[PDB]
Amino acid sequence: SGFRKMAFPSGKVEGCMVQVTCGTTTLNGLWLDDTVYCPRHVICTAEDMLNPNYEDLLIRKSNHSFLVQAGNVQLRVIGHSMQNCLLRLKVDTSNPKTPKYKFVRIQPGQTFSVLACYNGSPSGVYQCAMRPNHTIKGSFLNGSCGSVGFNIDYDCVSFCYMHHMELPTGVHAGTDLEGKFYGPFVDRQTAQAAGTDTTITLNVLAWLYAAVINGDRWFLNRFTTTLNDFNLVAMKYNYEPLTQDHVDILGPLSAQTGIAVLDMCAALKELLQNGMNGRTILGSTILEDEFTPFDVVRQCSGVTFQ
């Protein structure tokens, strides 16, 4: 029993974190095999960040312009190249702790674990959801750039996020491990701001299924709804439209609980229109949207508390 925002064990990632310094700028890097990946803005000073031309700034650097430190050991850079918004620093030693891994670009609404790091030293781990507006509500301080996001599938680490910037509202923006930003953001100091966000409908439904699996049905009702009628309510409450693909994804949870997807949608519609009347669901007083259908199946029992 219980239901918590649960991160994946971070050990496999901790062994890959290093520190990268260029000039007076230091941030984190990810060391896999003989390559260290880090934000390319490590080559920028606060002043360069106003209007950096990375091609021009990088051509002025040599391999020894970069200092890479793994724990107490200094790694020697023997090559460098830029890939989108990341730098790939080839070093003379292969990381003996490299786990089996993959680079994946996650989609909006999906979740991942973040290993917050400073000076190449892991400091904390927590779960984040990629918001529909392509930002994440992380917890980062100066020096956290290069910290990574990941999911673990068996013993394979699927890296999906590298941290690059904080936006005006305190939320965060970054790239996948190929250096492509999530969202319309860029790695330069501009007036860019997070666009309007929306609640992740599929995740809210998944979590309501989790509540039933864990033994709570107070919020269910005798009604059903069509996808279109549900979506009229979703637009009013700033929820993403429900799609048939979402309905299909919810099949396994619907099967485990015996509650048809559109019937759970009718329950959600009522919760949105009437509120929760002082009650809680899985300990929460609000509708949680940062657990995916996969997250629920991962954490909840496979047997419903009927």
From Swiss-Prot:
Coiled coil: none annotated. It is found in: Host cytoplasm; Host Golgi apparatus. It catalyses: TSAVLQ-|-SGFRK-NH2 and SGVTFQ-|-GKFKK the two peptides corresponding to the two self-cleavage sites of the SARS 3C-like proteinase are the two most reactive peptide substrates. The enzyme exhibits a strong preference for substrates containing Gln at P1 position and Leu at P2 position. Residues 1-306 are cytoplasmic. Changing residue 248 to E: In strain: Isolate BJ04. The active site is at residues 41, 145. Residues 1-306 form the Peptidase C30 domain. Monomer. Homodimer. Only the homodimer shows catalytic activity. Cleaves the C-terminus of replicase polyprotein at 11 sites. Recognizes substrates containing the core sequence [ILMVF]-Q-|-[SGACN]. May cleave human NLRP1 in lung epithelial cells, thereby activating the NLRP1 inflammasome pathway. Also able to bind an ADP-ribose-1''-phosphate (ADRP). May cleave host ATP6V1G1 thereby modifying host vacuoles intracellular pH. This is 3C-like proteinase nsp5. The chain holds residues 3241 to 3546 of 7073 of the full protein.
